[PDB]
Amino acid sequence: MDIFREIASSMKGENVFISPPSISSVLTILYYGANGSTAEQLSKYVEKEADKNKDDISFKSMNKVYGRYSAVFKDSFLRKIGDNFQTVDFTDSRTVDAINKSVDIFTEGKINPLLDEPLSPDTSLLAISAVYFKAKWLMPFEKEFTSDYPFYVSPTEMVDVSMMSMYGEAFNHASVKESFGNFSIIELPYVGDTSMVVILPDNIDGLESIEQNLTDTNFKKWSDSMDAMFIDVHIPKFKVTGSYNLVDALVKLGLTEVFGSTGDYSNMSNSDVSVDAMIHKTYIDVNEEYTEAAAATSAL
């Protein structure tokens, strides 16, 4: 959650949507190749779990690491990344359009241009993770109730929006009461094994102190305290897209010797490889029938 905390912290007042696994996916790649301080300093985010090309009902992931066509890599590192490595010419124009296409196809055309400006001719390597998710609500919102409800962008700024609603149902609710504000937390399950846990501050403006306290411990804690309750639900059907550069965030989180020349990726290549940017683009779409989400990140 800390990376989210960080990203969300920088762009206060703006929609944000990230995918911790996708991000951790590449950081793990980098880890396998990292050595010295870079390694341990990056170990804090290592998880071989979602760092693969798996799938669990409605979520599918994919890993790909492209190396400089001229560099020579380590066998051991290559052993871990396994079936997800290729040597490409970065100065090659087509290359960029090759990658984007791969991510494009894979994410149902949701995250198309993963890479923007032509890929710098000096980039040593490019680690990538893509993820796709789409599942239907176990309890499809009543289409015959989706009306316009006012939304508080701020206590003053009012903006109508489509509000999905459903009554007469029971959901796992909970009314946490913490020193940093009070909120309600509910669970809208999707068919399968995944759900959406929404955290709604009780006051129309207490989200900040809450978010800056969102930790995996807390979240887990508050989630457990949830019990089957009867609540009428009103959640906005939205659809947003994101584009973030996690270099800033990650550095503040402690990853100082990870980006730039100080980066020690010795266990990856005899050459002097480096990565200067972490791109993360995302997509989500929530409506009264299903939820489609997807994201992709690359360490340029």
Binding site: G13, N15, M163, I210, V240, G242
Partner: protein
């Protein structure tokens, strides 16, 4: 007994009792 998400909120997609698949903040409608 009413959960009305008509103001900034946090949402998280996840595996029943597993890892967090996603996590975002809904601040503005952004008519996409």
């Amino acid at each position: 007994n009413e959960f009305s998400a008509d103001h900034p909120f946090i949402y998280v997609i996840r595996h029943v009792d597993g890892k967090i698949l996603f996590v975002g903040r809904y601040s503005s409608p952004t008519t996409n």
